[PDB]
């Protein structure tokens, strides 16, 4: 998986650092996006590549390799439309059925990740990348973890900077992350998508979000959002781990409703 720096051209125009680039392959160039560094963070990038290396699914961003140069670089195939949130912000015209299509795709990718016993831990509309307006992939495995064969959750020892507004109660309270907590995260993602890329819990501190959730309160239905899709968000936001559905159940719900609506 170790790539030749000579065969990689980087634009100095920053995407997000993530940079666009071109990599001369078997016979053709391939358009790639490149995650670039700058002891502790070296191992994290290499772990993230180690995660990606092991995944093979149409709805997951595919890694080309790693590259030691000016710094450590992670080289992935480019999804050129960028993050789903920014896209929807700039494209209010997208029909509900198109958003339904896209979130279902994310759930198949997440069902695959659940079957493979990996936890994403950063599932948000910002880490959903569009290849085309009708093709989404999950990205950014920086926080992801392979689950031990004997356990269904990963336990963090003390938090870092966490995307708290996407995190399930059990993650906040007990530092426990399972595919069910990704399911809660997916709910917030669905909210973000049907709100055309708006920020969740606008203006609130994470601590205030935790307090709100503990009171049984949830975000309201987004303008125009199919009622069944809002119902699915709420099922995803089941406070109790044991009664929140897994992705197998979420995907099936999404698949059935999608096929019903087309
Ligand atoms: C047009 N476009 C394409 C991408 C993009 C990044 C990327 C990474 C891997 C594969 N495909 C990708 N496509 C992108 C990212 C961003 C972007 O803002 N990325 C952040 C800062 C959230 C990453 O932390 C903005 C625009 C983009």
Swiss-Prot record:
Tissue-wise expression: Widely expressed in hematopoietic cells (at protein level). Expressed in neutrophils (at protein level). Within the B-cell compartment, expressed from pro- and pre-B cells to plasma cells.
Involvement in disease: Immunodeficiency 82 with systemic inflammation: An autosomal dominant immunologic disorder with onset in early childhood. It is characterized by recurrent infections with various organisms, and multi-organ inflammation that manifests as colitis, hepatitis, arthritis and dermatitis. Patients have a propensity for the development of lymphoma, usually in adulthood. Disease severity is variable.
Location(s) in or outside the cell: Cell membrane; Cytoplasm, Cytosol
Sites where the protein binds ATP: 35
Domain-level remarks: The SH2 domains mediate the interaction of SYK with the phosphorylated ITAM domains of transmembrane proteins. Some proteins like CLEC1B have a partial ITAM domain (also called hemITAM) containing a single YxxL motif. The interaction with SYK requires CLEC1B homodimerization.
Record gene name: SYK
PTM info: Ubiquitinated by CBLB after BCR activation; which promotes proteasomal degradation. Autophosphorylated. Phosphorylated on tyrosine residues by LYN following receptors engagement. Phosphorylated on tyrosine residues in response to IL15.
Family: Belongs to the protein kinase superfamily. Tyr protein kinase family. SYK/ZAP-70 subfamily.
Modified residues (Phosphoserine): 207
Known partners and oligomeric status: Interacts with LYN; phosphorylates SYK. Interacts with RHOH (phosphorylated); regulates mast cells activation. Interacts with NFAM1 (phosphorylated); probably involved in BCR signaling. Interacts with VAV1 (via SH2 domain); phosphorylates VAV1 upon BCR activation. Interacts with GAB2 (phosphorylated); probably involved in IgE Fc receptor signaling. Interacts (via its SH2 domains) with CD79A (via its phosphorylated ITAM domain); the interaction stimulates SYK autophosphorylation and activation. Interacts with FCRL3. (Microbial infection) Interacts with Epstein-Barr virus LMP2A.
Active-site residue list: 122 (proton acceptor)
Modified residues (Phosphotyrosine): 2, 112, 135, 153-154, 174, 257-259
The name this protein goes by in its record: Tyrosine-protein kinase SYK
Domain Protein kinase, first and last residues per copy: 9-259
Originating organism: Homo sapiens
Section covered of the full-length record: 363 to 634 of 635
Described function: Non-receptor tyrosine kinase which mediates signal transduction downstream of a variety of transmembrane receptors including classical immunoreceptors like the B-cell receptor (BCR). Regulates several biological processes including innate and adaptive immunity, cell adhesion, osteoclast maturation, platelet activation and vascular development. Assembles into signaling complexes with activated receptors at the plasma membrane via interaction between its SH2 domains and the receptor tyrosine-phosphorylated ITAM domains.
Domain of life: Eukaryota
């Amino acid at each position: 998986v170790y790539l030749d720096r000579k065969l990689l051209t980087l634009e100095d125009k920053e995407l997000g650092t993530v940079k666009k680039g071109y990599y001369q392959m078997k016979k053709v160039v391939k358009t790639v996006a490149v995650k670039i560094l700058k002891p502790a963070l070296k191992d994290e990038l290499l772990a993230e590549a180690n995660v990606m290396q092991q995944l093979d699914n149409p709805y997951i961003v595919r890694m080309i390799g790693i590259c030691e140069a000016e710094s450590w670089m992670l080289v992935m195939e480019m999804a050129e439309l960028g993050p789903l949130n920014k896209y929807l912000q700039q494209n209010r015209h997208v029909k509900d059925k198109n958003i339904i299509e896209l979130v279902h795709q994310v759930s198949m990718g997440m069902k695959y990740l659940e079957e493979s016993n990996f936890v994403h831990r950063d599932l948000a509309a910002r880490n959903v990348l569009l290849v085309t307006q009708h093709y989404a992939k999950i990205s950014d495995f920086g926080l992801s973890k392979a689950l031990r064969a004997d356990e269904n959750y990963y336990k963090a020892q003390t938090h870092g900077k966490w995307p708290v507004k996407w995190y399930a109660p059990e993650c906040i309270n007990y530092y426990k992350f399972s595919s069910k907590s990704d399911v809660w995260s997916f709910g917030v993602l669905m909210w973000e998508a049907f709100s055309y890329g708006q920020k969740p819990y606008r203006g609130m501190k994470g601590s205030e979000v935790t307090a709100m959730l503990e009171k049984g309160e949830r975000m309201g239905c987004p303008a125009g959002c199919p009622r069944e899709m809002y119902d699915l968000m709420n099922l995803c936001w089941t406070y109790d781990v044991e009664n929140r559905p897994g992705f197998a159940a979420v995907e099936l719900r999404l698949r059935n409703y999608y096929y019903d609506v087309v």
